[PDB]
Design an enzyme around this catalytic site. Structure first.
Site, PDB file in Angstrom:
ATOM      1  N   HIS B  82       0.842  -1.190   0.000  1.00 18.08           N
ATOM      2  CA  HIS B  82       0.000   0.000   0.000  1.00 18.08           C
ATOM      3  C   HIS B  82       0.891   1.259   0.000  1.00 18.08           C
ATOM      4  CE1 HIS B  82      -2.747   3.108   1.435  1.00 18.08           C
ATOM      5  NE2 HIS B  82      -3.763   2.301   1.178  1.00 18.08           N
ATOM      6  N   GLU B  87      -3.025  -0.607  -3.699  1.00 20.91           N
ATOM      7  CA  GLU B  87      -4.138  -0.885  -2.796  1.00 20.91           C
ATOM      8  C   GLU B  87      -4.509  -2.359  -2.982  1.00 20.91           C
ATOM      9  OE1 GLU B  87      -6.194   2.984  -4.482  1.00 20.91           O
ATOM     10  OE2 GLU B  87      -7.524   2.041  -3.006  1.00 20.91           O
ATOM     11  N   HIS B 119      -8.723  -0.619   7.063  1.00 23.62           N
ATOM     12  CA  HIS B 119      -9.047  -1.517   5.947  1.00 23.62           C
ATOM     13  C   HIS B 119      -9.882  -2.749   6.309  1.00 23.62           C
ATOM     14  CE1 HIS B 119      -6.546   0.842   3.254  1.00 23.62           C
ATOM     15  NE2 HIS B 119      -5.536   0.747   4.103  1.00 23.62           N
ATOM     16  N   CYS B 181       4.261 -19.007   4.350  1.00 20.59           N
ATOM     17  CA  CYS B 181       3.877 -19.946   5.407  1.00 20.59           C
ATOM     18  C   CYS B 181       3.075 -21.140   4.858  1.00 20.59           C
ATOM     19  CB  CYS B 181       3.107 -19.184   6.463  1.00 20.59           C
ATOM     20  SG  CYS B 181       2.934 -19.964   8.080  1.00 20.59           S
TER      21      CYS B 181
END
Ligand SMILES: [Mg+2]
Ligand SMILES: [Mg+2]
Lengths: 279, 279
Positions: B82, B87, B119, B181
């Site tokens: 961002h 965005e 957000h 991950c």
């Protein structure tokens, strides 16, 4: 007892009903009674249960109500129906696991709890409703569609094309449609089309009661819309303005007004369904 | 601190990580640093985030792990991106709200918390992934697909036709794919088809580490399958066998090994994406 909404820490800005509201609206033992079906159905038709896949309902102040399907409303009618020889299968819109209001589970009920333990896998591992619908035809082994209540029924179901399709199938093929409390909000899924439930009469949870909850903390805020008023716009008749445990039959549409109506609805459904299949 | 799984009462037989495991694997403040982008992108392309719609992961003993997306893994790369002028928008498979591991939220972080508050609506009100996919073409204003980790990424994503379609679009159109991950388990969605990620190299969370958690109570049981071994069968190379916060770039596939890699991944993604759009 506290009237403050109780935080559900699993989710951001979410709340269970207040201690006080739980003491008014839940019990550790259900009113299950009258399960006496000496000549059960022996065929393969099942109840198709359309359940809630989302626990969190947004309220008007941005807080989430930690809800789901009401376990009394869903398990009592299913208990009677299973006793009458109708097993059930569960579908959600996403295919994700059923989300219950566990805070309303009759945890000390010696009949309902074993039933839940026996069948919880069916709720936890449901079909995706669209997959069930894709396969539906005149010979499908579903005797009814059951939409249990709880405020979880207000999420997704009222907007669902899959729910619309399922209900159209049931009506076209002269099957049963069973629902209670906020469950009939699912009927709103038919708003875009030719509406085969136009003219039908039902019991449902009164919108007025949903405006008295938030003050006692049963929900953390108000609903942003009201299903009863919308169903009336959709050409359905709601016959009750109160909560008395009332049930209603209009042709093969069998409904109840609240958790109090759950036992009576199981009985009416079992009686009606046995008669239809008999034989 | 207790090593006993902590009950999540919202759901039947579900557990949060143990007090002890939380003290080892979470902090109230993140490692966010190095957000220095003096010449950000000024166009309209966004990060498309594919997030988790289900909090509950079944373990091998029937207990549910109360998981979701990892908030550090999802918010740190998005913070950097961002800042670099990208965005984001969020999609889930069902269209239901993103489910976070709130127990890993850096609640005292003076930068990340305001970003989340600003957000959170995007996560709570995501698009349905299939709807996004239906609209995709060569000119679509998505610069990347981001699949954050957390054990919630193991639910649905690895089996999703919509996820497969999205990833095929990104690769065909030379866009970025970012994950860390357990996020890369989503790449398993490509198992049925021609597999455009064959040959690609990644960092990922080591399967071996997932077998040491349940003893300290981070999860209430073991995983029933292991994504790393499966990705290797799918022709992908996992370059790390440990957790060090490592990140990797293979063409436009940018990955990280764990929450420790989240800041570094945001930096690598921002650097790579700025260069690609410049200009
Ligand atoms: Mg008040
Ligand atoms: Mg042990």
């Amino acid at each position: 007892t506290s009237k403050n909404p109780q935080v559900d820490i699993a989710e951001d800005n979410a709340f269970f009903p207040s201690e006080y509201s739980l003491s008014q609206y839940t019990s550790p033992v259900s009113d299950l009674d009258g399960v006496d079906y000496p000549k059960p159905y022996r065929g393969k038709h099942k109840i198709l249960v359309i359940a809630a896949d989302e626990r969190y309902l947004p309220t008007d102040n941005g807080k989430l109500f930690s809800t789901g399907n009401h376990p009394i409303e869903t398990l009592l009618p299913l208990y009677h129906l299973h006793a009458a020889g109708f097993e059930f299968e569960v579908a959600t819109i996403s295919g994700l696991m059923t989300k219950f209001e566990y805070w309303a589970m009759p945890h000390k009920d010696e009949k309902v709890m074993p039933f839940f333990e026996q069948h919880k896998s069916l709720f936890r591992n449901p079909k995706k409703l669209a997959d069930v619908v894709a396969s539906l035809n005149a010979d499908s082994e579903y005797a009814a569609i059951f939409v249990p209540g709880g405020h979880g029924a207000l999420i997704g179901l009222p907007e669902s094309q899959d729910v619309a399709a399922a209900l159209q199938w049931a009506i076209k093929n002269d099957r049963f449609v069973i629902s209670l409390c906020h469950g009939p909000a699912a009927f709103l899924a038919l708003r875009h089309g030719d509406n085969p439930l136009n003219g039908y009469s039902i019991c449902a949870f009164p919108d007025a009661a949903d405006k008295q909850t938030p003050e006692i903390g049963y929900m953390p805020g108000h609903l942003t819309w009201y299903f009863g008023e919308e169903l009336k716009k959709m050409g359905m008749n709601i016959i009750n303005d109160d909560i008395t445990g009332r049930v209603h039959k209009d042709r093969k549409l069998l409904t109840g007004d609240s958790p109090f109506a759950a036992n009576a609805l199981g009985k009416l459904a079992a009686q009606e369904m046995l008669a239809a299949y008999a034989g």
